[PDB]
C-alpha cells in the first residue's frame, strides 16, 4: 500500500481529468505495483475530495458483475463505487454530452433502502428486509483514464458518472426480480437486451456483498441510500444527439437524450 | 364536379409538389367552389398516376376522426386515403427527412383483413369477422399544399391523398377478439420526452368503426376493402412534428412499441 | 420583488375579479417586469385573504405539467397553487356555471396524504411512503385575467392561484402500491362525445413526481404538505371548455368515473 | 457475377473444410469481386451437394439479426441459410465437439410451419397464420472460413455459419403469448454467460420469417409446410468446448440443455 499522500495525488489527477474532460494515463501504467487495496484507497480519497467540494453521498454501485460471472474474464469478484448527488438525472432529461469523456449507458436495478445494511454477515434476506423499493435505473459510466486495468477502473470510482432513475417503483416482494428484463433502444433501435438474473444470479446479491465489503471500514449502507446492483446489459456508447429509451416491460421505462 | 382533365392536372401538381418537396398553393383557394366529391376525384386521379408509375395499393387510412368527433370542429365526418407500398417503413427504421415537407407523426391502430369488406351495409361486426389481426401503426402525415397562404381546408387534405406520406407498423399482433380494443393506450415519446398520450376509444368510440364506414364510402365506386389490405383506423393523438435528428418511440403498453429515427 | 403592499393589492383585484366574474387585464401587462417570485407572492397573499374570509386549505395542485414537458413550450417547470375547501364538488354534482368566468375541465390523479411531506430532498419514494390513497380527480380551472388584451403569461396564471377554481373527486380509491399509476388512462366525454383521452404517464413521466417537486418548492417558505391534504398531480389531457348545460363524464376504466353537470 | 461452375468449386472447398474440420481462406479475399448474389449462389450449390449426398432440407435460419440492427455494424439486412437433417440434436444430447471447428451456441426461437409461406409479399401476419408452433431453439454456429464488411459474403457463402440446431422446451401456438417478451438465461457449466429478450430479433422474432419467404420467392422457392424456421439469436454466441454443459432457461417457455463430448 502506497502512503496516503500518493493516494491523494492520484485522486487529484482523476478529479482534474473529470473536470477538464481530459484523460490521464492509466494509473496502473504509471504505478505498475498498484494493488486493489491502493485502488480502493484512491477511490476513498477522490470521493472524500468531491464531498468536500460540496457533493453528498447518495448511495453506491456494484459493478463488473457480468465480468465476475463470465468464465472468460479473469475478474474474480465485483467492484464498487460511491454515488454522489450530482450524478443523478431525472427520467426524460437532456444530458450534457460535453460533461463526459467516453460516456456509455447500461441497464440496472436499484434498491432504495428503508433501513441500514451492515456486514460482515449481510445476506440476500437482509437486503429484502431493508429495501423500501426496487426501481429501474440506468447507469452512465465513463473513464478518466485512457484505454489505449481493473485497478484503474476501481481507482476511477468504478467508472461512475451518472445515474438515471425511472419506471415503476415496486416493493421487493411484488414480483420475482430475477425475471425483470429490458430492451435498450438507442436512436430507435434495440442495441442490447437482458434479464436481471444476469446480475449475480439475483440482482439483490450484490447489495449484501457490498455491505460485507464496507464493514471492515466501519462503513454501512445507510437508510435512504440508493444502491445500483450491476448492469445486465453490455454498456452502449452515448454520443451527442443520441436518444435512449430503455423498456423494462411491466417495470416501465427510462429515457434521456444526449445534447 | 370539375372535368376529369381538371382533376388530373390538380393531381399532377400535387405529385410534383411531393416529388420536389415544394408546396403548392391551397387547392381550395385556387378553386373556391371545389366540392368534397371533387377532392376525392383528385385523390383518385393522383393514386391512379402513382400506381401507373409502379406503386401498389396496400390499404387505406381513415383520418380526421378526432375532428369529426370534436364539437369545436366544423368537420362532420372522417376522411380517407389510399396507402401505397412505398409508404411503409419497418419498426426501428431511419426515415429520410428530406423525402418529406412538413412531416408529423401520429398514433393509430391498423386492421389487417383476412376477408374482403364491401358496403353499403358494412357494420362493426363485419369488420370483426373480416379482421385477421389488429396491430399498432404510426402514420407519418404531410402536406403538399401551404397551410397559410403566402389556411388550408378539408378539401385540400382530401385532395392531397388525406395527408398520407408514411406508415410504420410494429408491436404485438393480436386477434380482434383478444382484448378490448377500446382501451389500448399509448405514450408518444420524441427525443426521450412524452409529447402526447391517448386511448384508442378516442377514434370514433371504437377503432374498428371507421373500417365499416370506409367500406360503406367505397361501395358507390364499385370498390371494396380487399383481403390482405392494411386499414389504418385514425389517430388517437394529435400529430407531432418530425424534424431531422428526432427519435420517436411510441409505447402501446402491453401491445408493444413502434420507433424510428429521422435522418 | 414588489413590496408586500403591491402583492396584496394585485391579490385584491383578482379576488374582486373572481367575486364579480369579471376579468382584469393581464397582471403581466400592467407589471411588465413581474418575476416568478412576485407571482407566487401574489398567490400567497390571495390565499391569505381567502382563508381570512373563512376558507380552509385542503391541499395543493401542480399544474403546467404537459407544457413543462412539451419541447414546443417555453415553460421550463410546473406551477402550483392552493386548494381551498369551497373548491370541492362531489361526483355527480350540478356545478353553477355563473360562479365561473371561462371554466374548463381537465383530467388528473390526486394523492391523499397519510403523512406529511417536507423538502428540500423529497423523492418519489417519499411520496409513495406518505400517500394513503390515489384517487381520480377532475380539476375545474378558470382565468381571472383576460387571455387576449382588450396574451396572458405564466406570471398571470401563477398569480391567479394557478387557475384554480374547482376540484371534483370520484372513482375508485387505491393504495399507491396496488397498480402501476403510470398506465391509468381516461376518456373525457362532454355531452356524450369523447373530447380528449390521455394516460397518467403524461404527467411528468410518473404522476407522483410533481408531489415531491411541490414539497421541495414549499420547503424554503417553511411550508410542508400536511397529513390529510389532497394533492392534484397535473392534468394528462388538455382542458375542455365547460358551458351551461354541458354534462361531463370522465371514464378512468377500472379506476371508475367522475361526472358532473354545468347548470 | 461468377459463372455457376465457380460457385460449385467454392462450395466444394467449403464442403471439404467442413469434412476435414480445417478452415479455408476467406472467400472474399480469394475472390475480391464477389457479390452478395454470388454468396447466395455458393450457398445454394453447397446445399445442393449436401442433399445429393443424402441430407434432407428441414428448414432455414435467419441470421445477423443483431448486426443488421446495431448502428456499430455496417451490415444492412439479415442473412439466411439452410437447415439440413444432420444438423439437429435432441434436447439433453451429447454433441460431438470433434465434428466442429470453432462451434458457438446461441439462443433463438423457431417457427414450425403448418402451411407454406411464399413471397414476394409475405408479411408477419402470414407467418402467424402459417405457424403451427413456436418452440425454443439453440443454434450451434461454426466457421469454415478463417477470419483474419465483406466478411458478410463469407458468412453467407458458408451456409450462414450453420452447423447445428437443438430444439427443446415448451411448444406454443403463436397466439399463446407475446413472443417479443420471451426471455432466456444461457448457462454454461453452471454460470450465466448471456441473457436476452426475443424482441432483440428484429423487434419481433417472427419478422425474419416473412423477410425470408420474400428473399426466396425470386428463386421459385418457398418455405414449405413442415419446415422449422430459426428466427435469429437474441444473445451473443458463446464458445462451446469439449466438456461444456449448456442449459438455457427460457422461463415459462422451458429449457434446452446439451453437453459437448
Ligand atoms: O461496472 C459496472 O458499473 C457494471 O457492471 O454495472
Ligand atoms: O387525418 C388523419 O390521418 C388522422 O386523424 O389520423
Ligand atoms: O395547469 C394545470 O392545472 C394542469 O396542467 O393540470
Ligand atoms: O447469424 C445468426 O445465426 C444469428 O444472428 O442468429
Ligand atoms: Mg453499473
Ligand atoms: Mg392518420
Ligand atoms: Mg390541473
Ligand atoms: Mg442464429
Coordinates of N, CA and C in Angstrom, one line a residue, chain B residues 23-142:
Chain B
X23 N -44.2 22.9 -51.7 CA -45.7 23.0 -51.6 C -46.3 23.9 -52.6
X24 N -47.5 23.6 -53.0 CA -48.3 24.4 -53.9 C -49.3 25.2 -53.1
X25 N -49.9 26.2 -53.7 CA -51.0 27.0 -53.0 C -52.2 26.0 -52.7
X26 N -52.9 26.3 -51.6 CA -54.0 25.5 -51.3 C -55.0 25.5 -52.5
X27 N -55.3 24.2 -52.9 CA -56.3 23.9 -54.0 C -57.6 24.7 -53.7
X28 N -58.0 24.7 -52.5 CA -59.3 25.3 -52.1 C -59.3 26.8 -52.3
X29 N -58.1 27.5 -52.4 CA -58.0 28.9 -52.7 C -58.0 29.1 -54.2
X30 N -57.4 28.3 -54.9 CA -57.4 28.4 -56.4 C -58.7 27.9 -57.0
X31 N -59.4 27.0 -56.3 CA -60.7 26.5 -56.7 C -61.7 26.7 -55.6
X32 N -62.2 28.0 -55.4 CA -63.0 28.4 -54.3 C -64.3 27.6 -54.1
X33 N -64.8 27.0 -55.2 CA -66.1 26.2 -55.2 C -65.9 24.7 -55.3
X34 N -64.7 24.2 -55.0 CA -64.4 22.8 -55.0 C -65.3 22.1 -54.0
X35 N -65.8 20.9 -54.4 CA -66.7 20.1 -53.6 C -65.9 18.9 -53.0
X36 N -66.5 18.3 -51.9 CA -65.9 17.0 -51.4 C -65.8 16.0 -52.5
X37 N -66.7 15.9 -53.4 CA -66.6 14.9 -54.5 C -65.5 15.2 -55.4
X38 N -65.2 16.5 -55.7 CA -64.0 16.9 -56.5 C -62.7 16.5 -55.8
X39 N -62.7 16.7 -54.5 CA -61.5 16.4 -53.7 C -61.2 14.9 -53.8
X40 N -62.2 14.1 -53.7 CA -61.9 12.6 -53.8 C -61.6 12.2 -55.2
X41 N -62.1 12.9 -56.2 CA -61.8 12.7 -57.6 C -60.3 13.0 -57.9
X42 N -59.9 14.1 -57.3 CA -58.4 14.5 -57.4 C -57.6 13.4 -56.7
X43 N -57.9 13.0 -55.5 CA -57.2 11.9 -54.9 C -57.2 10.6 -55.7
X44 N -58.3 10.2 -56.3 CA -58.4 9.0 -57.2 C -57.5 9.2 -58.4
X45 N -57.4 10.4 -59.0 CA -56.5 10.6 -60.1 C -55.1 10.5 -59.6
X46 N -54.7 11.1 -58.5 CA -53.3 11.0 -58.0 C -52.9 9.6 -57.7
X47 N -53.8 8.8 -57.1 CA -53.5 7.4 -56.8 C -53.3 6.6 -58.1
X48 N -54.1 6.9 -59.1 CA -54.0 6.3 -60.4 C -52.7 6.5 -61.0
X49 N -52.2 7.8 -61.1 CA -50.9 8.1 -61.5 C -49.8 7.4 -60.8
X50 N -49.9 7.4 -59.5 CA -48.8 6.7 -58.7 C -48.7 5.3 -59.0
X51 N -49.9 4.6 -59.1 CA -49.9 3.2 -59.4 C -49.4 2.9 -60.8
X52 N -49.7 3.8 -61.8 CA -49.2 3.7 -63.2 C -47.7 3.8 -63.2
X53 N -47.1 4.6 -62.2 CA -45.6 4.7 -62.1 C -45.0 3.5 -61.5
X54 N -45.8 2.5 -61.0 CA -45.3 1.3 -60.5 C -45.5 1.0 -59.0
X55 N -46.3 1.9 -58.4 CA -46.7 1.7 -57.0 C -47.8 0.7 -56.9
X56 N -48.0 0.1 -55.7 CA -49.1 -0.9 -55.5 C -49.9 -0.4 -54.3
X57 N -51.2 -0.6 -54.4 CA -52.2 -0.3 -53.3 C -52.0 -1.4 -52.2
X58 N -51.7 -0.9 -51.0 CA -51.6 -1.9 -49.8 C -52.8 -1.7 -48.8
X59 N -53.5 -0.7 -48.9 CA -54.7 -0.5 -48.0 C -55.1 0.9 -48.0
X60 N -55.7 1.4 -46.9 CA -56.3 2.7 -46.8 C -56.2 3.2 -45.4
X61 N -56.3 4.5 -45.3 CA -56.5 5.1 -43.9 C -57.8 5.8 -43.8
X62 N -58.3 5.9 -42.6 CA -59.4 6.8 -42.2 C -58.8 7.9 -41.3
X63 N -59.1 9.2 -41.7 CA -58.5 10.3 -41.0 C -59.5 11.3 -40.4
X64 N -59.1 12.3 -39.8 CA -59.9 13.4 -39.2 C -60.9 12.9 -38.3
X65 N -60.6 11.8 -37.6 CA -61.5 11.1 -36.7 C -61.8 12.0 -35.5
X66 N -60.7 12.5 -34.9 CA -60.8 13.3 -33.7 C -61.6 14.6 -34.0
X67 N -61.3 15.2 -35.1 CA -62.0 16.4 -35.6 C -63.5 16.2 -36.0
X68 N -63.8 15.0 -36.6 CA -65.1 14.6 -36.8 C -65.9 14.5 -35.5
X69 N -65.3 14.1 -34.4 CA -65.9 13.9 -33.1 C -66.0 15.2 -32.3
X70 N -64.9 16.0 -32.3 CA -64.8 17.2 -31.5 C -65.9 18.2 -31.9
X71 N -66.7 18.7 -30.9 CA -67.8 19.6 -31.1 C -67.3 21.0 -31.6
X72 N -66.1 21.4 -31.2 CA -65.5 22.7 -31.7 C -65.0 22.7 -33.1
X73 N -65.1 21.5 -33.8 CA -64.6 21.4 -35.2 C -65.8 21.3 -36.1
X74 N -65.7 22.0 -37.2 CA -66.8 22.0 -38.2 C -66.8 20.7 -39.1
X75 N -65.8 19.9 -39.0 CA -65.7 18.6 -39.7 C -66.8 17.7 -39.2
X76 N -67.7 17.2 -40.1 CA -68.8 16.4 -39.8 C -68.6 14.9 -39.9
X77 N -67.6 14.5 -40.6 CA -67.2 13.0 -40.7 C -65.8 12.8 -41.1
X78 N -65.2 11.6 -40.9 CA -63.8 11.3 -41.2 C -63.5 11.5 -42.7
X79 N -62.2 11.5 -43.1 CA -61.8 11.4 -44.5 C -61.2 10.0 -44.7
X80 N -60.7 9.8 -45.9 CA -60.0 8.5 -46.2 C -59.0 8.8 -47.3
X81 N -58.0 7.9 -47.3 CA -57.0 8.0 -48.4 C -56.4 6.6 -48.7
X82 N -55.5 6.5 -49.6 CA -55.0 5.3 -50.1 C -53.6 5.1 -49.7
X83 N -53.3 3.9 -49.1 CA -51.9 3.6 -48.7 C -51.2 2.8 -49.8
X84 N -50.0 3.2 -50.2 CA -49.3 2.6 -51.2 C -48.0 1.9 -50.7
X85 N -47.5 1.0 -51.4 CA -46.4 0.2 -50.9 C -45.1 1.0 -50.5
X86 N -44.8 2.1 -51.2 CA -43.6 2.9 -50.9 C -43.8 3.8 -49.6
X87 N -45.0 3.7 -49.0 CA -45.2 4.5 -47.8 C -44.8 3.7 -46.5
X88 N -44.5 2.4 -46.6 CA -44.3 1.6 -45.4 C -42.9 1.5 -45.0
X89 N -42.6 1.8 -43.7 CA -41.3 1.6 -43.1 C -41.4 0.6 -42.0
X90 N -40.3 -0.1 -41.8 CA -40.3 -1.1 -40.7 C -40.1 -0.4 -39.4
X91 N -40.5 -1.1 -38.3 CA -40.2 -0.6 -36.9 C -38.7 -0.4 -36.8
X92 N -38.2 0.6 -36.2 CA -36.8 0.9 -36.0 C -36.0 1.4 -37.2
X93 N -36.7 1.9 -38.2 CA -36.1 2.4 -39.4 C -35.6 3.8 -39.2
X94 N -34.5 4.2 -40.0 CA -34.1 5.5 -40.3 C -35.0 6.0 -41.4
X95 N -35.7 7.1 -41.2 CA -36.6 7.7 -42.2 C -35.9 9.0 -42.7
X96 N -35.8 9.0 -44.1 CA -35.2 10.2 -44.7 C -36.0 11.4 -44.6
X97 N -35.6 12.4 -43.7 CA -36.4 13.6 -43.5 C -36.6 14.4 -44.8
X98 N -35.6 14.4 -45.7 CA -35.6 15.1 -46.9 C -36.6 14.7 -47.9
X99 N -37.1 13.5 -47.8 CA -38.2 13.0 -48.6 C -39.5 13.7 -48.4
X100 N -39.6 14.4 -47.3 CA -40.9 15.0 -46.8 C -40.8 16.5 -46.7
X101 N -41.9 17.1 -46.5 CA -42.0 18.6 -46.4 C -42.2 19.1 -45.0
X102 N -43.4 18.7 -44.4 CA -43.7 19.1 -43.1 C -44.2 17.9 -42.3
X103 N -43.3 16.9 -42.2 CA -43.9 15.6 -41.7 C -44.3 15.6 -40.2
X104 N -45.3 14.9 -39.9 CA -45.8 14.8 -38.5 C -46.1 13.3 -38.2
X105 N -45.9 12.9 -37.0 CA -46.2 11.5 -36.5 C -47.5 11.5 -35.7
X106 N -48.3 10.5 -36.0 CA -49.5 10.2 -35.2 C -49.7 8.7 -34.9
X107 N -50.6 8.4 -33.9 CA -50.6 7.1 -33.2 C -51.9 6.4 -33.5
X108 N -51.9 5.3 -34.1 CA -53.1 4.6 -34.6 C -53.0 3.1 -34.3
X109 N -54.2 2.5 -34.6 CA -54.2 1.0 -34.7 C -54.6 0.7 -36.2
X110 N -54.1 -0.5 -36.7 CA -54.4 -0.9 -38.0 C -55.0 -2.3 -38.0
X111 N -55.9 -2.5 -39.0 CA -56.7 -3.8 -39.1 C -56.2 -4.4 -40.4
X112 N -55.7 -5.6 -40.2 CA -55.2 -6.4 -41.3 C -56.3 -7.4 -41.7
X113 N -56.8 -7.2 -42.9 CA -58.0 -8.0 -43.3 C -57.7 -9.4 -43.8
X114 N -58.5 -10.4 -43.3 CA -58.4 -11.8 -43.8 C -59.4 -12.0 -45.0
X115 N -60.5 -11.2 -45.0 CA -61.5 -11.3 -45.9 C -61.9 -9.9 -46.4
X116 N -62.5 -9.9 -47.6 CA -62.9 -8.5 -48.1 C -64.1 -7.9 -47.3
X117 N -64.1 -6.6 -47.4 CA -65.3 -5.9 -46.8 C -65.9 -4.9 -47.8
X118 N -67.2 -5.2 -48.1 CA -67.9 -4.4 -49.1 C -69.2 -3.8 -48.5
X119 N -69.4 -2.5 -48.8 CA -70.6 -1.8 -48.4 C -71.7 -2.2 -49.4
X120 N -72.9 -1.6 -49.3 CA -73.2 -0.4 -48.5 C -73.6 -0.6 -47.0
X121 N -73.7 -1.8 -46.5 CA -74.2 -2.0 -45.2 C -73.3 -2.7 -44.2
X122 N -72.0 -2.3 -44.3 CA -70.9 -2.9 -43.5 C -71.1 -2.4 -42.1
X123 N -71.0 -3.3 -41.1 CA -71.1 -3.0 -39.7 C -69.8 -3.3 -39.0
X124 N -69.7 -2.8 -37.7 CA -68.6 -3.1 -36.8 C -68.4 -4.7 -36.8
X125 N -69.5 -5.4 -36.7 CA -69.4 -6.9 -36.7 C -68.8 -7.5 -37.9
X126 N -69.1 -7.0 -39.1 CA -68.4 -7.4 -40.3 C -66.9 -7.2 -40.2
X127 N -66.5 -6.1 -39.6 CA -65.1 -5.7 -39.5 C -64.4 -6.8 -38.6
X128 N -65.1 -7.1 -37.5 CA -64.5 -8.1 -36.6 C -64.4 -9.5 -37.3
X129 N -65.4 -9.8 -38.1 CA -65.4 -11.1 -38.8 C -64.3 -11.2 -39.9
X130 N -64.0 -10.0 -40.5 CA -63.0 -10.0 -41.6 C -61.6 -9.7 -41.2
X131 N -61.4 -9.3 -39.9 CA -60.1 -8.9 -39.5 C -59.2 -10.1 -39.0
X132 N -58.0 -10.2 -39.6 CA -57.1 -11.2 -39.2 C -56.4 -10.8 -37.9
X133 N -55.8 -9.7 -37.9 CA -55.0 -9.1 -36.8 C -55.3 -7.6 -36.7
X134 N -55.1 -7.2 -35.4 CA -55.0 -5.7 -35.2 C -53.5 -5.5 -34.8
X135 N -52.9 -4.4 -35.2 CA -51.5 -4.2 -35.0 C -51.4 -2.7 -34.7
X136 N -50.5 -2.3 -33.8 CA -50.2 -0.9 -33.7 C -49.6 -0.3 -35.0
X137 N -50.0 1.0 -35.3 CA -49.4 1.6 -36.5 C -49.2 3.1 -36.3
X138 N -48.1 3.6 -36.6 CA -47.9 5.1 -36.7 C -48.2 5.5 -38.1
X139 N -48.8 6.7 -38.2 CA -48.9 7.3 -39.5 C -48.0 8.5 -39.6
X140 N -47.2 8.6 -40.6 CA -46.4 9.8 -40.9 C -47.3 10.6 -41.9
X141 N -47.8 11.8 -41.5 CA -48.6 12.6 -42.4 C -47.8 13.8 -42.9
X142 N -48.3 14.4 -44.0 CA -47.5 15.5 -44.6 C -48.5 16.4 -45.3

